[PDB]
């Protein structure tokens, strides 16, 4: 749909990756932030609009994980189960071996910046 195409535009400057890359950030004590969601969900689309603006404003590097990528089905299931992400959108901030998860499509620009340490 037109709205899904707007989603693809909104996420154009996010870096597509997988849950394995998030686990690497945990294990290596890296700081990295991930938006996990799907273009097909209106709440993911709302969140992606807000996030898009934050990325444009800050020039931040934030990752995107497609929560319905066919080739990633059981890795996604396992990660979402292990880290408590039963709905999308999910916003995941990893730093110093610690993971923080928020599943709330309404997060404001400031809340997003606060959460991602921007």
User: Per the structure, how many domains does the chain have?
Assistant: 1
Domain span at 56: 1-118
What count of other Cβ atoms lies within 10 Å of the Cβ of residue 56? 11
Strands 32-37 and 15-16: unpaired
Q: Rounded to the nearest 5°, which phi and psi values hold at 29?
A: 55, 45
CATH number at residue 8: 3.40.30.10
Q: What is the resolution of the experimental data for this entry, in Å?
A: 1.2
DSSP string, 54-86: HHHHH----EEEETT-GGGHHHHHHHHHHHT--
Compute the distance between CA of residue 90 and CA of residue 19 in angstroms, rounded to an integer: 12
DSSP assignment letter at 91: E
Q: What's the start-to-end Cα distance of the chain, in Å? A: 32
Determination method here? X-ray
Question: How would you label 41-52 residue by residue, b for 16+ Cβ within 10 Å and e otherwise?
Answer: bebbbbbbbbbb
């Amino acid at each position: 749909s037109n709205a899904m195409e707007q989603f693809l535009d909104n996420i154009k400057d996010l870096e597509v990756t997988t849950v394995v890359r998030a686990q690497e950030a945990l294990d290596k004590k890296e700081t990295a932030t991930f938006f996990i969601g799907r273009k097909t969900c209106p709440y993911c689309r709302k969140f992606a609009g807000t996030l898009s603006g934050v990325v444009a404003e800050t020039k931040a590097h934030i990752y995107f994980i497609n929560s319905e990528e066919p080739s990633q089905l059981n890795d996604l299931q396992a990660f979402r189960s292990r880290y408590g992400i039963p709905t999308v959108p999910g916003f995941v901030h990893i730093t110093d071996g610690q993971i923080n998860v928020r599943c709330d499509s309404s997060m404001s620009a400031q809340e997003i910046k606060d959460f991602a340490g921007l």
